[PDB]
Amino acid sequence: ERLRCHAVHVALVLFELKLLLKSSGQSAQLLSHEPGDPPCLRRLNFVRLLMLYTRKFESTDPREALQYFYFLRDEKDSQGENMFLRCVSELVIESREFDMILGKLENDGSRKPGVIDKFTSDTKPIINKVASVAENKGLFEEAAKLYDLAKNADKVLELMNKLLSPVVPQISAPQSNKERLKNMALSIAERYRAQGISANKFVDSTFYLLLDLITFFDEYHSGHIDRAFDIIERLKLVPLNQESVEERVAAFRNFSDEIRHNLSEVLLATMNILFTQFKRLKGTSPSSSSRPQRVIEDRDSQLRSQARTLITFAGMIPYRTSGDTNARLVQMEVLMN
């Protein structure tokens, strides 16, 4: 125990002086013999010496664990991957010091260097290796931050769409997962639109449609309702004249599943908007509403036509909306006569 530090520093000396005999594979014991060497020699697994020493301080002093892995700058395995790139990717994935080790994006979308910018003239392959291992650990917010840090622009949106998807209909409460992912997505969208970035257009259009759907749900949750109508008539995720049902009933097959999984609650929100405008009309007493009565008769018919148009649309979607969402739509139209 008290001597591992000297054993490492003697091995680093023997390594740079090219005296150290190296064991030819990651999985080997700390010492080995090899099928070609004289039987009175041995080899050291130099990678395994370091990865059994840095692991005392990998989670506390990772700045200097990176220095010990920099002796692996020249080193490779049997696949040809670089052992500095490997051990630094494993280091960042458990030390979580993403901003310091790999650097950061500041608010303009410039890249601020980390400690790793001492050891390479391009950090992008390492940042994508860490983003991919973070993605394989389900750390999708950190993988998305790292894909923007490398400007693998499509992979940022391919994670933000998945992160926003089950979150778009939620109430925008302070500090919520919605309010975090909303302001992260808006922060990415402002960088992209300011720097002239655009991606694989199915992922790119899904990203903006999930952002504008967050404005539809927040202007519905605010009770501002007529605003959420003034949004959904522009988004055209739903029909509002029966003339447009087939247009949407086709277009649904070309939307992404992040959009499809949101459509039932967009229909319930749009139906509650219609059902509330209907209640607002029947509440605007003819003892004070100085309109021609035909400009109420108008909209007692328009809102039924729109309500039935949403029910015909729900009956033409080849994806399982729930029995509860479909019964709620029919119950709202039975209450709109």
């Binding site: 530090c5 301080f57 989670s59 506390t60 002093d61 001492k118």
Partner: protein, 96 residues
């Protein structure tokens, strides 16, 4: 003849369900049986990879020391480069 023409409707329905259930029992037990033997040969090949790396009886003792786990009581906080490993790490900074 009516009993025989009832019976051959029985053998013409009954029998392939036994051939089907013989297929489930066989193709489940053979998949447990061969998994259990495929699981084994890598134990032998791991003994070869261990013993041919140590050699004939020429390195063993891990050295005798205290164990540690996710239990117990550790007040000292966490930085873990000691005075000597910090002096060495500082000389590696002064190298790199």
């Amino acid at each position: 003849i009516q009993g025989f023409l009832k019976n051959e409707k029985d053998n013409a329905l009954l029998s392939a369900i036994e051939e089907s259930r013989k297929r489930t029992f066989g193709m489940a037990e053979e998949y447990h049986r061969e998994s259990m033997l495929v699981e084994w040969e890598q134990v032998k090949q791991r003994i070869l990879h261990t013993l041919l790396a140590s050699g004939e009886d020429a390195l063993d003792f891990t050295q005798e020391s205290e164990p540690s786990y996710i239990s117990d009581v550790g007040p000292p906080g966490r930085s873990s480069l000691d005075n000597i490993e910090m002096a060495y790490a500082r000389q590696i900074y002064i190298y790199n």
